[PDB]
C-alpha cells in the first residue's frame, strides 16, 4: 500500500472513530442542560436523577471522545506536514481558537458537571452544565470552521516569499458561509443523536415495564428536542446543499443523481504554468515579468500541484499525463452519491420517528402502543448512520483536495514510510478496537442497569 493511502485511511478511521462519540456528546449535553433546567424550574428531583443517569452515560461516551480527539489534533502535523506548512497560516487559527474558547470551556467544566453536584449550588451547576454544552458546540463551531475552509478556502492568498497560503481577512474565514451552515447542520445532527439515544433507551425500559417514570420523562424530552433538532437538521441540510452547490461542483453532482472534468484541463494548463513559475520563485527569482505572470496564474497553483503527481516532467507534460490528472481531479461519484442518500433517507426515517414520538408524547400516551417503543428502540443506530454518511460525503467529495483547488491530498502528506504508518495503524486500530469494545460494553451494562441502579 502507498504510505499516503495508509495516512488517508488512518485519518479516515480516526476521525470516524472520534465522531462515533462526538455527536452523542453534542446533543446529549444539551439534553442534560434541559433536564437540569427543568429540575431548577420545577424543583422536581426526578429530573436531577435523570441528569445524573444520562450524564453517566454521557461520561462513558465523553472519555473516548476526548481520547479520539487527541489523536486528531496532532495527526495534521504527524501525517500531513506539508498540509500544515502550506495552510497553517489560516487553518491553524480556527484550531487554536477552538482550544482557546471551546476546549477550555467544555473540558474545564465537564469535571464540575460530574463532580460539582454538591460543591456547586443548583444555579451554578446549571450554569456549568450549560457552559459544557456551549463549549462543546463552540468547539464544533471552530473545528467546522476549519473544515469548511478546507471546502471553501476564503480570505487567503499565496505568498511568494513564504511559499504558502497566507491570511488576507480573518472575517472572511469566520463568516465563511460553508462553515456557518456546516456548524449548524452538524450540531443539529448531534442534537438528533442525543435525543434518539435517550428515547431508544427509555423505550427499552418501557417495553420491560421498568424505570417507567424516568423513561416517560426522558422519552418526552427526547421527543420534543429531537423533533426540533431533526427539523433544524433537515433545513440546515438544505442550506448546506445550497452552499456546496455554490462552491463545490463535485458534491453538487453527487446530489444531482450521479463538464467539470473538461473544465479542469484549462485549469491544469494554467496550473502547470503556475507550478513552473513557483519553482522559479522558490529558486529566488524576482524578475518583474515573472511575478506578473505568477500573479496572473496563482489561482491554479493547486491544479499544477495536482498535475505534479501524474507528470514527473512538468516542463513537458504529455496528453496521457494530462488525462491521468484530468481523471484524478474528479473523485469517484458513487461513494458520495450513496453517502448523501443514506444521510437524507436516514433523516427522513428519523423525522418520522420523532414526529410519532412527539405525537404520543403530547397526547400523554407514550406507553400506550408498544410498537412506538419498539420503533424508537430500533431507531438508535440511524443518527450515527446518517452522520457517518454525511461526513463520508463531506470528506470523500472534496477528494482529491486537502484544500479545495489549493492543496491536493497526494501533495499534503508527510515524508513517512509504510513501516511508520503500519506501526501507527496497527497500534491505533488495536487500541481503538479494545476501547470501542470496552465502551460499548460499559454503555450497554449501565444503560441496562438503568436509573434505578443509580
Amino acid at each position: 500500500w502507498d504510505v499516503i493511502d495508509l495516512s488517508r485511511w488512518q485519518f479516515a478511521l480516526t476521525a470516524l472513530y472520534h465522531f462515533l462519540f462526538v455527536p452523542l456528546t453534542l446533543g446529549l449535553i444539551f439534553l442534560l442542560a434541559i433536564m437540569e433546567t427543568i429540575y431548577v424550574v420545577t424543583g422536581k428531583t426526578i429530573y436531577r436523577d435523570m441528569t445524573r443517569f444520562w450524564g453517566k452515560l454521557f461520561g462513558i461516551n465523553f472519555a473516548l471522545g476526548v481520547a479520539t480527539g487527541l489523536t486528531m489534533e496532532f495527526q495534521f502535523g504527524t501525517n500531513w506536514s506539508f498540509y500544515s506548512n502550506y495552510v497553517g497560516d489560516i487553518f491553524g487559527a480556527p484550531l487554536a481558537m477552538e482550544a482557546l474558547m471551546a476546549f477550555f470551556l467544555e473540558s474545564t467544566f465537564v469535571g464540575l458537571f460530574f463532580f460539582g453536584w454538591q460543591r456547586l449550588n443548583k444555579y451554578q451547576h446549571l450554569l456549568v452544565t450549560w457552559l459544557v454544552a456551549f463549549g462543546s458546540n463552540l468547539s464544533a463551531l471552530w473545528i467546522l470552521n476549519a473544515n469548511g475552509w478546507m471546502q471553501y478556502p476564503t480570505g487567503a492568498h499565496f505568498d511568494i516569499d513564504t511559499l504558502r497560503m497566507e491570511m488576507t481577512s480573518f472575517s472572511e474565514l469566520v463568516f465563511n458561509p460553508v462553515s456557518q451552515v456546516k456548524f449548524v447542520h452538524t450540531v443539529m445532527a448531534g442534537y438528533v443523536t442525543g435525543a434518539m439515544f435517550i428515547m431508544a433507551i427509555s423505550a427499552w425500559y418501557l417495553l420491560r415495564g421498568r424505570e417507567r417514570n424516568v423513561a416517560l420523562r426522558s422519552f418526552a424530552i427526547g421527543s420534543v428536542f429531537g423533533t426540533l433538532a431533526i427539523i433544524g437538521t433537515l433545513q440546515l441540510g438544505d442550506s448546506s446543499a445550497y452552499e456546496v452547490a455554490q462552491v463545490q461542483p463535485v458534491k453538487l453532482a453527487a446530489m444531482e443523481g450521479e463538464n467539470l472534468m473538461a473544465e479542469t484541463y484549462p485549469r491544469l494548463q494554467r496550473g502547470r504554468m503556475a507550478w513552473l513559475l513557483m519553482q522559479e520563485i522558490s529558486q529566488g527569482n524576482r524578475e518583474p515579468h515573472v511575478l506578473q505572470a505568477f500573479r496572473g496564474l496563482e489561482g491554479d497553483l493547486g491544479y499544477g500541484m495536482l498535475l505534479s503527481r501524474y507528470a514527473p516532467d512538468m516542463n513537458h507534460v504529455t496528453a496521457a499525463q494530462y488525462q491521468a490528472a484530468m481523471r484524478g481531479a474528479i473523485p469517484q461519484v458513487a461513494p458520495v452519491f450513496w453517502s448523501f442518500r443514506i444521510m437524507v433517507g436516514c433523516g427522513s426515517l428519523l423525522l418520522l420517528v420523532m414526529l410519532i414520538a412527539l405525537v404520543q408524547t403530547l397526547r400523554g400516551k407514550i406507553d400506550q402502543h408498544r410498537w412506538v417503543l419498539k420503533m424508537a428502540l430500533w431507531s438508535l443506530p440511524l443518527p450515527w448512520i446518517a452522520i457517518e454518511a454525511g461526513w463520508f460525503m463531506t470528506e470523500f467529495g472534496r477528494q482529491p483536495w486537502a484544500i479545495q483547488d489549493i492543496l491536493p491530498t497526494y501533495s499534503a502528506h508527510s515524508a513517512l514510510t509504510t513501516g511508520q504508518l503500519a506501526f501507527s495503524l496497527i497500534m491505533i486500530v488495536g487500541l481503538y478496537t479494545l476501547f470501542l469494545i470496552a465502551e460499548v460494553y460499559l454503555m450497554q451494562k449501565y444503560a441496562r442497569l438503568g436509573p434505578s441502579a443509580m
Binding site: 444539551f30 427543568i38 449548524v184 450540531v187 418526552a220
Partner: peptide
C-alpha cells in the same frame, strides 16, 4: 448570519423542551 441564528435557536429549542415538560409533567 448562522451563528446568531444557532444561538437563538438552541435557546428556543431548550426553552420549548423545558416549557413542554413543565406543562406535560402533571399528565405523566
Amino acid at each position: 448570519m448562522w451563528y446568531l441564528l444557532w444561538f437563538v435557536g438552541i435557546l428556543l429549542m431548550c426553552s420549548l423542551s423545558t416549557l413542554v415538560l413543565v406543562w406535560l409533567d402533571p399528565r405523566l
